[PDB]
Amino acid sequence: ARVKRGVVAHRRHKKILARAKGYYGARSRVYRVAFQAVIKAGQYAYRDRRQKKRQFRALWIARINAGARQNGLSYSRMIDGLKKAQVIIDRRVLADIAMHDAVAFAALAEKAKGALA
Amino acid sequence: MEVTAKLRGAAISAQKARLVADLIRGKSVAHALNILNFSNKKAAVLVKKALESAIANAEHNNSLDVDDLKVSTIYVDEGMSLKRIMPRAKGRADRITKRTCHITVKVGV
Amino acid sequence: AVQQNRKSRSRRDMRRSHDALTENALTVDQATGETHRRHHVTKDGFYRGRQLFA
Amino acid sequence: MYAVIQSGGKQHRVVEGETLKVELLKAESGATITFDDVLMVVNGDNIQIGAPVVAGAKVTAEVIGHGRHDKIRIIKMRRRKHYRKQQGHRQWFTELKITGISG
Amino acid sequence: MKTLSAKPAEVQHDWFVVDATGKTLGRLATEIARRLRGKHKTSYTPHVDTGDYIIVINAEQVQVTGNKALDKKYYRHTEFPGGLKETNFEKLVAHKPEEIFERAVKGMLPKGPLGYAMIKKMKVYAGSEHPHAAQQPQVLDI
RNA sequence: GUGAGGGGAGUGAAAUAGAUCCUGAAACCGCAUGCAUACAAGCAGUGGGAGCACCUUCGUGGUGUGACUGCGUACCUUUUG
RNA sequence: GCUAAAACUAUGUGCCGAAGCUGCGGAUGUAUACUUUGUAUACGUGGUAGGGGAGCGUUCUGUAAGCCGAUGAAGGUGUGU
């Protein structure tokens, strides 16, 4: 019962190459080089799915800080004031408000400094 | 409605022939013929023969006028190679490859 | 001495970037009207209103 | 007007007529869900910032359906150690359409 | 996608003029870098340039503390062997204060194409006059 | 060039079934179309992300391209590493 | 780059900061309870040498004188799922 490998092997190599398309030089043409490229891409994706949350939190904090300093407070003091006032709006929403609506962010800053004092 | 001519099996490297091919690509037939006639390259003779055959095909089989004909397309492809052996010093042997090419030219109004 | 790595097709093409050919200087000779190479006798032996052969 | 709502451990800013995706909810397709824990409601110059929650605010929405997101591939590999692992993933979601906002 | 990034086309750059008489170099440079990068706007995006144009006048009056005026050394190497050249703060401020400010700010700015583009928005002049009246800069105290 | 090689006509169900002639994969090498690219330093990807071209149920859409930006020194074997 | 510091000693308030902890959704091993069922509960789910368990796919024999097929099989090349 002799078995030929051609069809299955070709299908596997073709699938790897198809996943590899868009890379430079031998990475998108040669199976040996392409197979390594796919695995490293997967590893980078696994690490970046975690890094993304940190990066977006840092961006939100920066925008909130800019808005707070326009309204006369630092980011840390505004966060403390909001916590004292018992406001539970998160930083993503606070940053969106800071970017798109200055009056509402000013009202929030007023509330925070009122709680501070 | 391009008219095509193919010269298969010319005994010259495609790298060498493609220089003349690029030199004449996209120009009018009369100017291209003058260039080929006054060039000194070996590939020029073969390209000229292919172009003349294409113009004859367009005139005879398609009832077209040469005055409005330009070199609409042209390209060279590699053909089958011949393998030879070159003796070297101290009994060492090397493999010689003799290359051939196919020339395709299309003329259209 | 020999390469440690095989060169890329892109680098090979970049090296060949200076390989393009050029046209010669062709003009029409007034005596016969046939296209000829500038400053050269025509294929029929005509130049500057003189015929070399018979 | 716009409002801020909580759902699935995250917060969203919404307006009437908007469509959004949230974590898989148990509500049946075509049903209506009401949020009564609004944190903030803005209407022009009228700004209500509920400390825990604005009293009387209500956001009503309809459940269009449920679905799954695009596939993600997980890969783990330890070089020179002869170890490898893979798995796929598709996160469920419920799609909502905001139909009413009341302060 | 509820979080959005600033669009370069929609960005607006405002012009300001700053006087350097009597101020401390580093503490001024920090604020200049902040404004050049655009950290002071709620639309700040790391991959976009949202800063403002900053003109500096009376740059040769900038001050340092301690003995740094004599003991602070600026180096530069020509790639020839033994080609290390040295100068100090007083001579360099006398000759090319623009270089002083350029070094101070480029040190505090990011390193890349965006950093190079951002540093172009700073204009430094040794005198009390600047050629940018057409842009109508406003006085900024920093 | 009474060459080779082609184009038309004709045969055939089929002529990229035309005689190193069933199907005709990959490496490698051409032509054409769209986007990017000549002030910027590194395993070439990954997470974000403006602009452009085409298709559009014009949509919070689809297909190509990817200015700018955070992170990031291949695989196997053998080893304390 | 920094000098009543952006250095050192002592002290207070706040904040940033990990794949640690919490929140939302999903998968799975063991043991209990519901004393049928597969539903809840509790704990657990980094890993080399190595041990245990469960599957995908390929050639051929029976089921097969059956079923699909020139209204197009295998094979090749794209798309969607």
XYZ file of C-alpha atoms (C1' of nucleotides) in Angstrom:
687
model
C 0.000 0.000 0.000
C 2.269 2.761 -1.292
C 1.208 6.339 -0.488
C 2.260 9.459 -2.394
C 2.744 12.718 -0.474
C 2.418 15.236 -3.295
C -1.147 16.505 -2.952
C -1.158 16.968 0.833
C 2.339 18.460 0.940
C 1.485 20.897 -1.859
C -1.708 21.958 -0.082
C 0.162 22.680 3.162
C 2.928 24.649 1.439
C 0.368 26.605 -0.594
C -1.567 27.561 2.541
C 1.604 28.793 4.255
C 2.593 30.823 1.187
C -0.905 32.311 0.950
C -0.662 33.455 4.559
C 2.771 34.911 3.722
C 1.660 37.177 0.854
C 2.668 40.834 1.012
C 6.157 40.293 2.451
C 9.420 41.321 0.804
C 11.711 39.210 -1.345
C 12.134 35.571 -0.381
C 9.739 35.909 2.575
C 6.741 35.868 0.207
C 8.155 33.411 -2.365
C 10.250 30.729 -0.600
C 8.642 28.190 1.722
C 11.599 27.873 4.102
C 11.895 31.628 4.654
C 8.129 32.195 4.520
C 7.322 29.645 7.233
C 9.604 31.427 9.709
C 7.995 34.770 8.844
C 4.459 33.583 9.663
C 5.400 32.276 13.125
C 7.203 35.482 14.117
C 4.186 37.485 12.937
C 1.950 35.393 15.186
C 4.253 35.937 18.164
C 4.289 39.694 17.570
C 0.486 39.699 17.375
C 0.291 37.834 20.687
C 2.504 40.445 22.369
C 0.839 43.460 20.743
C -2.687 42.455 21.765
C -1.439 43.170 25.292
C 0.651 46.251 24.445
C -2.349 47.957 22.806
C -4.224 48.499 26.079
C -1.226 50.227 27.666
C -0.711 52.482 24.647
C -4.362 53.559 24.505
C -4.483 54.214 28.259
C -1.396 56.423 27.955
C -3.000 58.373 25.102
C -6.188 58.921 27.120
C -4.195 60.105 30.138
C -2.263 62.593 27.991
C -5.427 64.085 26.487
C -7.099 64.328 29.903
C -3.999 66.075 31.251
C -4.079 68.621 28.427
C -7.742 69.389 29.089
C -7.208 69.651 32.841
C -4.292 72.060 32.455
C -6.389 74.174 30.117
C -9.012 74.277 32.892
C -6.388 75.061 35.547
C -5.681 71.658 37.134
C -3.167 68.853 36.836
C -4.222 65.363 35.769
C -3.502 63.819 39.176
C -5.406 66.523 41.056
C -8.393 66.258 38.712
C -8.494 62.469 39.108
C -8.343 62.829 42.899
C -11.108 65.431 42.854
C -13.354 63.266 40.690
C -12.775 60.268 42.963
C -13.709 62.396 45.979
C -16.811 63.633 44.130
C -17.661 59.934 43.440
C -17.711 60.320 39.642
C -17.089 56.931 38.023
C -16.679 57.944 34.368
C -13.659 56.190 32.886
C -10.636 57.721 31.192
C -11.656 56.718 27.659
C -14.931 58.645 27.963
C -13.190 61.530 29.734
C -10.661 61.820 26.894
C -13.380 61.669 24.239
C -15.254 64.455 26.046
C -12.066 66.501 26.422
C -11.381 66.242 22.695
C -14.915 66.863 21.418
C -16.700 69.101 23.990
C -14.847 71.762 25.978
C -17.861 73.035 27.942
C -18.655 69.633 29.457
C -15.022 69.013 30.407
C -14.944 72.452 32.035
C -18.038 71.532 34.057
C -16.352 68.285 35.122
C -13.249 70.225 36.182
C -15.437 72.621 38.176
C -16.998 69.660 39.980
C -13.583 68.119 40.663
C -12.077 71.289 42.141
C -15.233 71.809 44.184
C -14.784 68.348 45.674
C -11.108 69.147 46.275
C -12.048 72.288 48.224
C -6.903 45.082 -32.756
C -3.173 44.404 -32.523
C -1.385 42.217 -35.080
C 1.222 39.886 -33.609
C 4.438 38.201 -34.727
C 6.548 35.654 -32.844
C 10.154 34.627 -33.524
C 10.876 31.510 -31.473
C 14.308 30.037 -30.857
C 16.640 32.936 -31.647
C 20.214 32.070 -30.645
C 20.957 34.988 -28.324
C 20.469 35.809 -24.657
C 17.197 37.434 -23.645
C 19.145 39.909 -21.517
C 20.985 41.100 -24.632
C 17.887 41.220 -26.856
C 15.762 43.107 -24.316
C 18.060 46.129 -24.653
C 17.025 46.622 -28.290
C 13.447 45.706 -27.385
C 13.336 48.557 -24.858
C 15.097 50.866 -27.314
C 12.258 50.457 -29.835
C 9.279 49.901 -27.492
C 6.344 52.236 -28.075
C 7.523 54.107 -31.189
C 6.303 54.434 -34.762
C 7.223 51.718 -37.247
C 9.227 53.988 -39.563
C 11.390 55.445 -36.787
C 11.894 51.995 -35.255
C 12.943 50.601 -38.642
C 15.469 53.408 -39.087
C 16.907 52.749 -35.620
C 17.216 49.015 -36.277
C 18.762 49.571 -39.716
C 21.426 51.908 -38.324
C 22.194 49.975 -35.115
C 25.218 47.688 -34.732
C 23.727 45.110 -32.334
C 23.171 41.470 -33.258
C 19.719 41.489 -31.635
C 18.714 44.330 -33.969
C 18.645 42.060 -37.032
C 16.340 39.527 -35.364
C 14.062 42.229 -33.942
C 13.863 43.846 -37.383
C 12.924 40.539 -39.002
C 10.158 40.000 -36.438
C 8.853 43.562 -36.852
C 8.816 43.283 -40.647
C 6.912 40.003 -40.416
C 4.393 41.671 -38.094
C 3.898 44.601 -40.481
C 3.431 42.192 -43.390
C 0.830 40.266 -41.387
C -1.038 43.479 -40.573
C -0.999 44.617 -44.206
C -1.910 41.286 -45.822
C -4.227 39.449 -43.392
C -5.937 42.447 -41.750
C -6.103 45.062 -44.547
C -4.460 47.780 -42.444
C -2.371 50.808 -43.418
C 1.278 50.916 -42.356
C 1.402 54.713 -42.074
C -0.632 54.694 -38.841
C 1.074 51.635 -37.317
C 3.117 51.948 -34.123
C 4.920 49.373 -31.990
C 2.102 48.757 -29.524
C 3.764 45.925 -27.571
C 6.999 43.934 -27.494
C 8.735 41.535 -25.116
C 11.401 38.825 -25.011
C 11.158 35.545 -23.088
C 13.710 32.846 -22.307
C 13.740 29.638 -24.346
C 15.245 26.185 -24.035
C 18.978 26.099 -23.321
C 21.707 23.826 -24.672
C 24.196 22.226 -22.277
C 27.912 21.890 -23.044
C 31.113 20.999 -21.185
C 34.242 23.165 -21.062
C 37.483 21.451 -19.941
C 39.475 23.355 -17.315
C 42.887 22.941 -15.712
C 43.913 19.870 -13.703
C 41.081 17.728 -15.063
C 38.232 19.904 -13.769
C 35.106 20.289 -15.909
C 32.538 23.095 -16.028
C 28.999 23.261 -17.412
C 28.344 25.754 -20.222
C 24.788 26.934 -20.887
C 23.891 28.331 -24.312
C 20.757 30.462 -24.123
C 17.972 31.146 -26.619
C 15.066 33.581 -26.694
C 11.570 34.163 -28.074
C 10.669 37.628 -29.393
C 7.029 38.779 -29.496
C 5.985 42.035 -31.191
C 2.494 43.495 -31.666
C 1.692 46.458 -33.930
C -1.533 48.434 -33.680
C -3.003 51.666 -34.977
C 37.225 36.546 -2.491
C 33.512 35.821 -2.926
C 30.154 36.980 -1.577
C 28.964 35.924 1.869
C 25.304 36.286 0.811
C 23.435 36.021 -2.473
C 22.551 39.438 -3.874
C 18.914 40.462 -4.208
C 17.151 40.840 -7.548
C 16.392 44.443 -6.577
C 20.105 45.205 -6.122
C 20.930 43.463 -9.409
C 18.397 45.657 -11.218
C 19.729 48.748 -9.445
C 23.202 47.921 -10.768
C 21.801 47.398 -14.279
C 20.013 50.779 -14.110
C 22.813 52.240 -16.311
C 22.536 49.696 -19.156
C 20.071 51.453 -21.480
C 21.052 51.963 -25.115
C 20.998 55.218 -27.078
C 20.006 56.243 -30.591
C 22.481 57.308 -33.255
C 22.325 60.642 -35.082
C 20.264 60.137 -38.252
C 19.478 62.831 -40.818
C 18.032 63.198 -44.312
C 20.573 63.921 -47.041
C 19.196 66.533 -49.425
C 20.837 65.035 -52.519
C 18.721 61.857 -52.543
C 16.264 62.313 -49.664
C 17.147 58.945 -48.129
C 17.740 58.753 -44.397
C 21.457 58.383 -43.684
C 23.864 58.545 -40.762
C 25.058 62.094 -40.123
C 28.526 62.933 -41.526
C 28.721 59.538 -43.307
C 28.418 58.579 -46.961
C 25.098 57.008 -47.909
C 24.828 53.300 -48.650
C 24.782 54.163 -52.381
C 28.031 56.151 -52.330
C 26.547 59.666 -52.168
C 27.946 62.464 -50.011
C 27.806 66.263 -50.239
C 26.568 66.139 -53.821
C 29.246 63.740 -55.054
C 29.048 60.100 -56.145
C 32.122 57.946 -55.560
C 31.297 54.992 -57.830
C 29.966 54.797 -61.381
C -28.286 65.153 23.185
C -25.928 62.368 24.244
C -25.544 60.066 27.229
C -22.995 57.795 28.905
C -23.957 54.188 29.675
C -22.346 51.108 31.231
C -22.478 47.612 29.753
C -20.251 44.546 29.809
C -17.698 46.116 32.136
C -17.092 49.066 29.793
C -18.550 52.526 29.196
C -19.942 54.026 25.994
C -21.033 57.471 24.819
C -24.174 57.250 22.691
C -26.729 59.329 20.795
C -30.150 58.475 19.399
C -30.169 56.347 16.259
C -26.691 54.946 16.890
C -25.766 51.284 16.460
C -23.107 49.719 18.680
C -21.706 46.341 19.705
C -21.467 45.118 23.307
C -20.622 41.880 25.076
C -23.002 38.968 24.540
C -26.286 39.731 26.303
C -28.955 37.156 27.127
C -31.831 39.217 25.703
C -33.740 37.736 22.780
C -33.482 39.191 19.289
C -35.877 42.060 18.652
C -36.413 42.753 22.357
C -35.898 46.070 24.144
C -33.469 46.777 26.990
C -33.430 49.856 29.216
C -30.425 51.260 31.070
C -31.356 53.141 34.253
C -27.778 53.704 35.512
C -26.789 56.634 33.291
C -23.649 58.440 34.451
C -23.904 61.617 32.367
C -26.477 63.312 30.130
C -25.735 66.339 27.937
C -28.396 68.362 26.103
C -26.945 71.579 24.741
C -25.945 73.626 27.780
C -27.846 71.361 30.210
C -25.146 69.102 31.667
C -26.104 66.457 34.238
C -23.171 64.609 35.828
C -24.543 61.962 38.158
C -22.098 61.330 40.970
C -22.808 57.589 40.968
C -25.770 57.970 38.591
C -28.179 60.582 37.237
C -31.609 60.235 38.849
C -34.425 59.743 36.347
C -32.229 59.227 33.283
C -33.146 56.303 31.026
C -31.645 55.005 27.775
C -33.770 52.544 25.806
C -32.472 50.389 22.966
C -33.416 47.415 20.804
C -31.474 44.185 20.275
C -30.753 43.659 16.577
C -29.063 40.302 17.079
C -25.977 38.377 18.116
C -22.852 37.466 16.183
C -19.153 36.666 16.372
C -16.104 38.755 15.515
C -13.450 37.866 12.953
C -11.131 34.973 13.745
C -7.885 35.560 15.645
C -4.984 33.091 15.655
C -2.958 32.451 18.812
C 0.616 31.172 18.425
C 3.118 30.209 21.132
C 6.664 29.081 20.312
C 9.843 28.597 22.368
C 12.957 28.648 20.193
C 15.426 25.741 20.549
C 13.073 24.007 23.029
C 10.868 21.882 20.732
C 7.546 23.393 21.893
C 4.662 24.882 19.896
C 0.941 25.611 20.285
C -1.893 27.151 18.257
C -5.591 27.902 18.694
C -8.310 30.046 17.140
C -10.775 32.430 18.771
C -13.979 34.310 17.918
C -15.562 36.604 20.509
C -19.352 36.795 20.714
C -21.178 40.122 20.617
C -24.689 41.542 20.857
C -25.608 44.450 18.594
C -27.809 47.225 19.987
C -29.600 50.201 18.445
C -30.224 53.181 20.726
C -33.880 54.146 20.274
C -34.529 56.601 23.121
C -32.645 58.883 25.502
C -34.399 60.690 28.364
C -32.819 62.807 31.087
C -12.797 53.197 16.615
C -14.558 55.479 19.091
C -11.163 56.997 19.905
C -10.000 59.201 17.039
C -6.658 60.568 15.868
C -6.016 64.127 14.732
C -6.052 64.702 10.974
C -2.956 66.544 9.671
C -5.046 68.545 7.194
C -7.278 69.880 9.986
C -4.343 70.862 12.229
C -3.856 74.577 12.915
C -0.465 75.997 13.926
C -0.474 79.235 15.926
C 2.500 81.601 16.100
C 4.052 82.880 19.332
C 7.130 84.978 20.131
C 9.223 84.467 23.276
C 11.980 86.635 24.758
C 14.946 84.808 26.289
C 16.406 87.665 28.359
C 17.346 86.457 31.833
C 15.716 83.018 31.658
C 17.277 79.633 32.383
C 18.138 77.621 29.289
C 16.898 74.164 30.277
C 13.703 75.274 31.998
C 12.823 77.331 28.920
C 13.744 74.485 26.562
C 11.393 72.056 28.301
C 8.392 74.325 27.680
C 9.501 75.016 24.101
C 9.700 71.268 23.454
C 6.254 70.735 24.974
C 4.692 73.358 22.717
C 6.560 72.139 19.625
C 5.322 68.587 20.194
C 1.777 69.715 20.990
C 1.390 68.143 24.432
C -0.716 71.174 25.429
C -3.680 70.374 23.137
C -6.526 67.946 23.793
C -6.102 66.706 20.201
C -2.538 65.469 20.827
C -1.650 62.421 18.728
C 1.801 60.774 18.983
C 2.120 60.123 15.234
C 0.819 63.564 14.167
C 2.411 67.001 14.526
C 0.000 69.313 16.376
C 2.451 71.863 17.802
C 2.793 75.609 17.351
C 5.360 77.931 15.802
C 7.739 79.431 18.366
C 9.995 82.402 17.594
C 12.791 83.255 20.040
C 14.325 86.728 20.343
C 17.328 87.950 22.334
C 18.690 84.400 22.286
C 22.226 85.505 23.196
C 21.005 86.702 26.623
C 20.143 83.176 27.809
C 21.643 82.344 31.200
C 23.132 79.376 33.051
C 23.863 78.911 36.752
C 27.003 77.972 38.647
C 30.246 77.949 36.670
C 28.608 76.307 33.649
C 29.228 79.453 31.590
C 32.920 78.524 31.635
C 32.836 74.778 32.326
C 30.096 73.511 29.973
C 31.747 71.952 26.923
C 30.324 71.344 23.448
C 32.077 68.673 21.381
C 31.996 67.651 17.740
C 33.975 65.028 15.833
C 35.041 65.204 12.231
C 35.311 61.624 11.023
C 39.031 62.093 10.326
C 41.454 60.486 12.812
C 42.134 62.652 15.843
C 39.489 65.131 14.697
C 37.766 66.059 17.968
C 36.942 69.763 18.348
C 35.817 71.455 21.555
C 34.290 74.751 22.648
C 32.561 76.218 25.704
C 29.306 77.957 26.528
C 30.530 81.559 26.644
C 32.311 81.443 23.276
C 29.470 79.503 21.661
C 26.825 81.911 22.985
C 28.897 84.835 21.725
C 29.272 83.291 18.264
C 26.176 81.151 17.471
C 23.395 81.164 20.092
C 21.150 79.569 17.468
C 23.269 76.432 17.845
C 22.824 76.589 21.630
C 19.039 76.565 21.337
C 19.100 73.985 18.539
C 21.119 71.557 20.664
C 19.000 72.154 23.768
C 15.715 71.539 21.947
C 16.816 68.672 19.690
C 18.069 66.846 22.767
C 14.565 67.013 24.258
C 12.692 66.287 21.010
C 12.026 62.811 19.554
C 14.543 61.370 17.092
C 13.069 60.615 13.679
C 11.378 62.184 10.658
C 8.620 63.577 12.882
C 11.213 65.085 15.217
C 13.072 66.710 12.333
C 9.813 68.164 11.015
C 8.824 69.379 14.493
C 12.100 71.206 15.104
C 11.591 73.235 11.903
C 8.851 75.226 13.673
C 11.361 77.039 15.936
C 12.969 80.309 14.794
C 15.826 81.746 16.869
C 17.348 85.207 16.402
C 20.096 86.944 18.362
C 18.605 90.430 18.013
C 15.369 91.984 19.226
C 13.790 91.935 15.741
C 12.387 89.070 13.676
C 11.328 88.928 10.010
C 7.993 87.188 10.664
C 5.678 90.169 11.191
C 3.425 88.815 8.436
C 2.438 85.786 10.537
C 1.337 88.017 13.450
C 2.903 86.174 16.409
C 1.517 86.744 19.896
C 3.542 87.311 23.049
C 3.929 84.198 25.205
C 5.548 84.343 28.649
C 7.477 81.150 29.391
C 17.957 33.493 -47.253
C 13.364 28.506 -51.629
C 16.552 28.679 -43.879
C 14.451 28.658 -39.019
C 10.146 30.947 -37.110
C 5.468 32.926 -37.632
C 0.352 35.114 -39.579
C -4.083 33.890 -42.491
C -6.937 29.819 -44.761
C -8.516 24.667 -44.013
C -9.241 19.705 -40.650
C -10.958 18.426 -35.983
C -15.743 17.898 -30.505
C -11.122 20.455 -28.892
C -4.981 23.328 -32.473
C -1.935 27.674 -25.459
C -4.659 18.724 -28.811
C 0.548 21.315 -34.402
C 4.236 16.777 -33.892
C 10.004 16.336 -26.888
C 2.334 17.541 -29.342
C -2.952 14.516 -22.450
C -3.143 17.647 -17.674
C 1.039 21.627 -17.274
C 2.228 22.769 -10.233
C 7.070 25.459 -7.844
C 11.645 27.546 -7.943
C 13.487 31.392 -11.788
C 12.570 35.323 -15.769
C 9.379 39.095 -18.833
C 5.283 42.716 -20.199
C 0.850 45.934 -18.449
C -2.287 48.502 -14.651
C -2.913 51.088 -9.165
C -0.537 52.961 -4.893
C 4.296 54.122 -2.399
C 9.509 55.735 -2.958
C 15.611 60.201 -4.100
C 16.950 64.381 4.283
C 16.753 59.185 5.820
C 20.194 54.319 9.586
C 19.580 47.841 11.744
C 15.942 39.856 11.359
C 12.094 43.719 7.191
C 7.302 42.081 10.967
C 3.618 43.458 14.427
C -0.233 47.142 17.099
C -2.028 51.691 15.501
C -2.960 55.154 11.377
C -3.555 59.936 7.150
C -3.891 60.187 2.097
C -4.764 57.950 -2.977
C -7.052 54.529 -7.080
C -11.067 51.171 -8.243
C -15.992 48.642 -6.902
C -19.799 50.331 -4.511
C -26.332 48.065 -1.453
C -22.453 54.593 -1.553
C -22.178 52.206 4.561
C -19.693 52.813 10.826
C -18.809 49.025 3.458
C -15.311 46.040 0.092
C -10.506 45.430 -2.829
C -5.261 47.212 -3.629
C -1.310 50.734 -1.556
C 0.767 52.322 3.103
C 3.160 58.771 4.480
C 3.877 59.102 9.990
C 4.300 56.332 14.854
C 5.163 52.545 19.917
C 7.437 47.597 20.345
C 10.957 44.356 18.218
C 18.956 41.175 17.393
C 16.095 34.541 12.034
C 15.540 28.766 12.405
C 17.764 23.927 13.969
C 21.375 21.362 16.682
C 24.401 21.244 21.164
C 24.925 23.282 25.835
C 25.657 25.859 32.652
C 24.602 29.390 29.172
C 19.889 69.464 30.567
C 19.579 70.468 36.232
C 22.025 74.743 41.754
C 16.108 78.318 47.721
C 17.417 71.551 42.071
C 15.237 68.142 38.154
C 21.073 66.848 44.236
C 21.101 64.906 49.804
C 18.496 64.167 54.799
C 13.260 63.923 57.285
C 7.961 64.288 56.587
C 2.786 64.517 54.193
C -0.847 64.382 50.360
C -1.931 62.677 45.306
C -0.928 60.246 40.988
C 1.703 56.777 37.112
C 3.146 51.997 36.743
C 2.957 44.255 35.149
C 0.458 38.902 31.224
C -0.119 40.505 39.723
C -5.585 41.493 41.563
C -10.957 43.015 40.160
C -14.980 43.620 36.180
C -17.558 41.558 31.447
C -17.702 37.318 27.771
C -15.849 32.205 26.244
C -13.163 27.204 26.568
C -11.524 23.110 29.338
C -9.403 18.826 33.714
C -10.693 16.930 38.566
C -14.231 16.397 42.762
C -18.994 17.265 44.802
C -24.753 18.306 44.569
C -29.041 17.877 41.605
C -29.203 11.304 44.258
C -31.110 9.390 35.640
C -29.475 12.773 31.734
C -25.535 17.987 31.717
C -26.972 21.459 34.631
C -24.851 24.354 38.924
C -20.924 24.583 42.652
C -15.262 24.485 44.383
C -10.456 24.254 42.979
C -7.187 24.102 38.860
C -5.302 24.973 33.374
C 3.973 28.294 32.323
C 6.990 24.035 31.024
C 12.574 20.704 28.652
C 13.848 14.962 29.192
C 9.684 11.975 29.944
C 4.700 9.452 31.135
C -0.872 9.268 30.232
C -5.391 10.451 27.216
C -8.147 12.069 22.614
C -8.308 13.061 17.365
C -7.344 15.042 11.755
C -5.730 13.682 7.120
C -3.391 9.948 2.975
C -3.012 4.638 -0.246
C -5.694 -0.090 -0.405
C -9.918 -4.384 1.077
C -15.471 -5.336 2.316
C -20.346 -2.873 2.596
C -20.125 -1.653 -3.591
C -23.616 -5.188 -9.926
C -24.864 0.210 -4.362
C -24.375 6.003 -4.924
C -22.039 10.690 -7.918
C -20.345 11.718 -13.169
C -19.624 14.386 -20.742
C -26.162 18.670 -18.053
C -18.444 17.401 -16.862
C -14.698 12.704 -12.437
C -9.803 13.161 -10.461
C -6.031 16.907 -10.768
C -4.594 22.626 -11.257
C -5.884 27.920 -10.102
C -9.205 31.943 -7.205
C -13.376 33.283 -4.037
C -16.708 32.727 0.133
C -17.721 30.178 4.531
